[PDB]
PDB file of C-alpha atoms in Angstrom:
ATOM      1  CA  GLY A   1      59.738 -18.771 -33.954  1.00 12.02           C
ATOM      2  CA  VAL A   2      56.970 -18.389 -30.962  1.00 12.61           C
ATOM      3  CA  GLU A   3      58.349 -20.919 -27.812  1.00 11.53           C
ATOM      4  CA  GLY A   4      54.528 -22.918 -27.606  1.00 11.69           C
ATOM      5  CA  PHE A   5      51.411 -21.407 -29.836  1.00 13.76           C
ATOM      6  CA  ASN A   6      51.946 -19.279 -33.160  1.00 13.51           C
ATOM      7  CA  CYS A   7      50.665 -16.114 -31.959  1.00 13.18           C
ATOM      8  CA  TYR A   8      51.727 -12.887 -33.986  1.00 13.57           C
ATOM      9  CA  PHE A   9      50.579 -11.144 -31.434  1.00 11.76           C
ATOM     10  CA  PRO A  10      53.471  -8.848 -29.413  1.00 11.75           C
ATOM     11  CA  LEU A  11      53.482 -11.815 -26.376  1.00  8.54           C
ATOM     12  CA  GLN A  12      57.219 -11.376 -25.967  1.00  6.13           C
ATOM     13  CA  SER A  13      56.414  -7.929 -25.074  1.00  4.15           C
ATOM     14  CA  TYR A  14      53.740  -9.302 -22.361  1.00  4.37           C
ATOM     15  CA  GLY A  15      56.554 -11.662 -20.386  1.00  4.33           C
ATOM     16  CA  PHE A  16      57.116  -8.564 -18.922  1.00  3.34           C
ATOM     17  CA  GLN A  17      54.618  -7.562 -18.027  1.00  3.95           C
ATOM     18  CA  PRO A  18      52.109  -8.694 -14.713  1.00  4.80           C
ATOM     19  CA  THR A  19      50.250 -12.020 -16.138  1.00  4.92           C
ATOM     20  CA  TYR A  20      49.909 -16.297 -15.645  1.00  4.27           C
ATOM     21  CA  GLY A  21      51.451 -17.116 -18.909  1.00  2.88           C
ATOM     22  CA  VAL A  22      54.465 -15.465 -18.277  1.00  3.38           C
ATOM     23  CA  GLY A  23      55.575 -16.700 -14.811  1.00  2.92           C
ATOM     24  CA  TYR A  24      58.778 -17.246 -16.024  1.00  3.68           C
ATOM     25  CA  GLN A  25      60.846 -17.190 -13.595  1.00  4.52           C
TER      26      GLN A  25
END
């Protein structure tokens, strides 16, 4: 369900935080 690697972690919540792993312009 997670776009990409299967990470149970709240990777979707980090999409709003500063990080290179979530650089969606």
